[PDB]
Design a protein around this ligand. Structure first.
Ligand SMILES: [Cl-]
Ligand code: NA
Length: 207
């Protein structure tokens, strides 16, 4: 039964102290081996586990299932409430999986929606999940479309978000240093928040 399978996952995954590949691989196999109706039921049951590793497994399933708007909304609104930081990392990966499946250019309205969400975890999942942004389709040929979107969050009230924003710009600066330099030149570094983001973003820029 489904309940018995979740119990097995709890026994097996609770031993895993680091990483995410074991949970990811199992989620992928299960997603590919069963019809969507079944796997959606399993993902919701697994996500209620008190074992965070099993919730990680469930959020990978959500990512594979995320063409279903109901699943994507649950990711946006409910998984974003998870108190476990490792689950939050998987949320970022599952969002990236959504974007990859529908296509990054086609995903832009959703990316913009998540970046403007009220939940800081929703904003961070988008910023972090797409790193390195300019390695992704669309953004790799249009790097300012990534830089501008990330830089919009440079005054975010959340330090969690700001660290992701600064790091995401930092990523891009390693392959497009002039474009990041050009973006940063306009910043008025007056707040504690923007200076934190600037310090992360500008490490490899000859400003
Ligand atoms: Cl990457
Ligand atoms: Na990553």
């Amino acid at each position: 039964s489904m309940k018995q399978y979740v119990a097995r996952l709890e026994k097996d995954f609770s031993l895993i102290e680091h990483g995410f590949k074991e949970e990811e691989q199992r989620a992928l196999t299960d997603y590919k081996s069963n019809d969507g109706e079944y796997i959606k039921k399993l993902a919701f049951l697994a996500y209620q586990s008190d074992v965070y590793q099993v919730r990680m497994y469930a959020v990978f399933l959500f990512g594979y299932l995320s063409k279903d708007k109901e699943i994507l909304i649950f990711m946006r609104d409910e998984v974003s409430k998870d108190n476990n930081w490792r689950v939050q990392e998987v949320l970022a990966k599952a969002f990236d999986e959504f974007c990859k499946k529908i296509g990054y250019k086609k995903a832009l309205p959703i990316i913009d929606e998540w970046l403007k969400s009220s939940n800081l975890h929703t904003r961070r999942a988008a910023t972090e999940g797409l790193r390195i942004w300019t390695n992704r389709p669309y953004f790799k040929e249009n790097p300012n479309e990534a830089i501008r979107r990330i830089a919009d969050l440079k005054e975010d009230v959340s330090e969690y978000v700001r660290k992701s924003v600064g790091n995401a710009l930092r990523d891009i600066s390693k392959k497009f240093p002039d474009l990041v330099k050009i973006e940063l030149k306009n910043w008025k570094l007056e707040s504690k928040e923007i200076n934190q983001v600037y310090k992360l973003a500008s490490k490899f820029i000859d400003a």
